[PDB]
């Protein structure tokens with residue numbers, strides 16, 4: 119299954135930096151493995167195939183590939199939020215502020231309100247879930263449109279960081295394909 | 311429909327002309343993505359380069375990623391997207407190129423890690439728009455810096471009245487543009503005569 | 505004075521010409537509002553349409569609201585203001601229109617709930633400024649989507665050297681502008697005589 | 698009177714959407730009943746007729762209509778704060794942050810100090826009072842200008858939410874024309890009157 123394939127790729131090609139950051143630039147965050155992305159998208163679609171999804175929401179840039187493969191299988195469009203000023207993202211903006219615990223800056227992410235309806239049932243897709251600030255921002259943007267959230271699909275979850283618990287506590291269904299329990303001693307340990 | 315037909319229909323029906331030089335397609339390419347259209351676009355690119363020995367796709371965040379990934383999926387090759395800003399893990403073996411912005415009137419840097427580009431690679435560059443061509447030239451430079459060859463450049467929407475295409479063709483590169491726009495004057499899209 | 509002359513004097517005495525083509529009137533129209541002047545403006549609009557069988561006024565947030573509500577008060581009709589952004593309760597039967605900005609070369613969407621526009625409505629559109637006219641075209645479209653008819657368009661300040669007015673008039677719409685500005689060059693406001 | 702007319706309108710046309718949301722788009726928040734707005738303004742003016750009001754402060758968009766009718770009766774100007782960048786609100790900006798529980802995100806509202814002096818005795822007018830964050834923002838803006846606050850006039854107050862108590866605790870006179878004790882079980886229940 120996709121989970122096993124992903125876990126294998128992490129153990130084979132991932133590099134643990136400073137027992138804290140998991141570098142997977144060979145297939146997710148810089149180089150993209152399209153076949154693996156398709157398997158990931160088919161797994162997300164499988165979990166939400168009976169939820170009435172109308173639209174997927176993600177955020178540039180690493181989330182786009184898994185989100186688009188998921189939208190392809192479910193047959194729904196994919197909207198990616200913008201982090202920086204863009205040429206054609208100008209008005210009708212739904213925005214949220216994303217605080218970085220790392221560099222200690224608040225930044226703004228934005229989605230055009232014309233692409234989210236009160237009748238939309240949204241699946242949020244993202245590559246990493248760590249502290250979860252962008253995920254909260256996308257939840258806010260979806261709620262600002264009057265739309266409902268079917269759930270949140272995450273490729274890699276760092277389960278020792280509070281992002282997941284924050285979303286689940288608020289009632290959101292979180293579907294993480296790889297759940298990392300620890301990165302200490304320079305190696306990846308998966309949950310259970 | 312083939313990819314070109316479906317893309318021209320989407321442009322006609324949903325594209326919005328904002329000026330002589332700007333065509334808004336945020337409903338299916340630049341903010342909302344139509345994944346099925348992207349697959350057809352990727353399959354079309356793969357067909358045109360099916361016999362050319364492609365080993366890797368190179369694109370640039372963010373709008374180029376979706377058409378690039380669909381092309382790599384069909385061809386069965388990896389996809390590398392250059393980054394425009396500093397990122398958490400793009401930290402070593404950096405290949406850099408200066409990209410002049412016409413609005414900002416200054417150069418910004420794009421980067422790819424050489425870890426993912428070999429001198430044995432035969433690269434297909436994929437991007438969403440071709441206008442003044444500065445990003446395309448930067449991606450060409452990065453591929454060359456890696457010692458790799460360039461099979462061609464695949465473009466979803468080309469503005470044929472701007473110099474980007476002619477500059478790449480004059481350098482000898484194969485440019486495959488699925489929608490070629492002759493003009494946006496009068497607030498309407500006019501495609502190159504076929 | 506009548507409303508037109510009161511408005512022109514206020515423009516001359518408190519308006520500021522920015523970049524020789526933008527008229528700043530934040531002291532009484534676009535940020536601070538002079539309610540008494542607004543009432544006189546509304547009464548004049550009402551006078552010009554007092555025998556067209558107006559059933560409803562349509563405007564757009566935010567600067568159009570005050571003159572529109574004063575017009576609706578005198579004519580005895582409700583006022584509907586279009587929205588430029590998401591609103592908590594704006595969800596049902598939304599009629600939308602695209603508004604292009606020649607100044608910024610961008611496009612935005614405005615919306616009105618169809619629940620508040622009937623095929624039996626005869627609508628007077630009220631707005632604060634008429635320049636390039638794209639918002640006015642958008643409100644016209646929304647009224648037509650509802651099957652209602654347009655009695656005319658009342659404008660507080662018209663920049664007559666810009667094409668908005670001629671576009672609307674060409675299409676047969678009555679445009680009633682209380683202050684018609686012929687020029688803003690030389691940092692002075694010249695009115696159409 | 699205006700309170701009776703308002704309660705009737707709420708009873709006849711208000712739609713309860715939730716335990717926390719009352720839809721009144723038919724006369725206050727989208728379609729406006731100007732005559733009712735007049736009644737509301739005259740009532741606000743009556744309650745503050747002897748208090749030396751020099752200016753009304755409100756916030757776009759729903760607050761404008763009741764605020765302007767109030768200023769018309771009292772014979773004073775009305776200033777509406779803005780929530781978004783606008784063409785001519787460019788200098789002497791007095792700003793306040795406003796948090797939304799509904800949104801879980803913050804927002805900025807602004808007034809130009811050119812239209813507020815330390816000579817001003819301000820009546821704040823708004824359409825709804827719920828959690829009260831926008832009201833506190835307007836209070837902050839008026840205090841930033843060195844002006845005094847005569848009180849806060851509210852068309853519809855949800856008394857079961859903490860907005861009113863916070864302002865009363867800070868010493869402000871809050872005059873609410875309709876006070877809703879509960880929206881439970883899809884019905885509007887008003888605060889008991891003796």
Ligand SMILES: Nc1nc2c(ncn2[C@@H]2O[C@H](COP(=O)(O)OP(=O)(O)O)[C@@H](OP(=O)(O)OP(=O)(O)O)[C@H]2O)c(=O)[nH]1
Nearest residue numbers: 139140141178179180181217218219220246248249250398
């Ligand atoms: N590779 C990797 N990335 C991590 C890891 N932990 C967090 N990130 C990424 O760093 C960015 C910030 O995430 P957080 O770490 O939760 O935010 P924080 O700075 O407030 O803690 C995100 O990138 P992004 O916004 O998704 O960037 P982009 O890739 O889309 O440009 C996220 O995906 C990790 O262990 N490995």
Ligand SMILES: Nc1nc2c(ncn2[C@@H]2O[C@H](COP(=O)(O)OP(=O)(O)O)[C@@H](OP(=O)(O)OP(=O)(O)O)[C@H]2O)c(=O)[nH]1
Nearest residue numbers: 331332333334335371372373374411412413439441442443
């Ligand atoms: N929608 C639209 N975009 C155009 C058009 N022409 C150029 N662009 C986009 O603008 C960006 C380049 O901006 P400039 O620095 O002014 O370069 P330019 O002179 O070639 O336009 C590119 O975005 P990018 O780097 O691809 O950004 P992103 O979309 O990946 O974030 C390119 O795709 C057009 O007609 N319509």
Ligand SMILES: Nc1nc2c(ncn2[C@@H]2O[C@H](COP(=O)(O)OP(=O)(O)O)[C@@H](OP(=O)(O)OP(=O)(O)O)[C@H]2O)c(=O)[nH]1
Nearest residue numbers: 525526527528529565566567568605607633635636637784
């Ligand atoms: N003060 C002033 N404003 C002008 C002038 N010309 C245009 N505007 C205003 O600028 C805003 C945007 O106009 P555009 O849609 O770009 O097209 P326009 O310039 O032809 O109006 C409109 O405000 P709006 O949507 O009504 O904004 P709001 O005030 O309701 O927030 C319009 O009223 C001018 O000379 N002076």
Ligand SMILES: Nc1nc2c(ncn2[C@@H]2O[C@H](COP(=O)(O)OP(=O)(O)O)[C@@H](OP(=O)(O)OP(=O)(O)O)[C@H]2O)c(=O)[nH]1
Nearest residue numbers: 593717718719720757758759760797798799825827828829
């Ligand atoms: N219809 C309705 N609206 C409510 C109710 N409670 C609060 N609001 C409105 O929702 C908007 C946002 O409120 P918030 O900033 O989230 O504060 P809140 O937590 O008290 O709602 C405000 O509109 P605003 O800024 O005045 O919006 P606008 O209408 O001026 O655009 C406020 O008037 C309610 O029960 N019914």
Ligand code: NA
Nearest residue numbers: 181244245246
């Ligand atoms: Na991400």
Ligand code: NA
Nearest residue numbers: 147180245246
């Ligand atoms: Na990431």
Ligand code: NA
Nearest residue numbers: 374437438439
């Ligand atoms: Na691009």
Ligand code: NA
Nearest residue numbers: 340373438439
């Ligand atoms: Na682009």
Ligand code: NA
Nearest residue numbers: 568631632633
């Ligand atoms: Na206006």
Ligand code: NA
Nearest residue numbers: 534567632633
């Ligand atoms: Na205006």
Ligand code: NA
Nearest residue numbers: 760823824825
């Ligand atoms: Na309000």
Ligand code: NA
Nearest residue numbers: 726759824825
């Ligand atoms: Na409100």
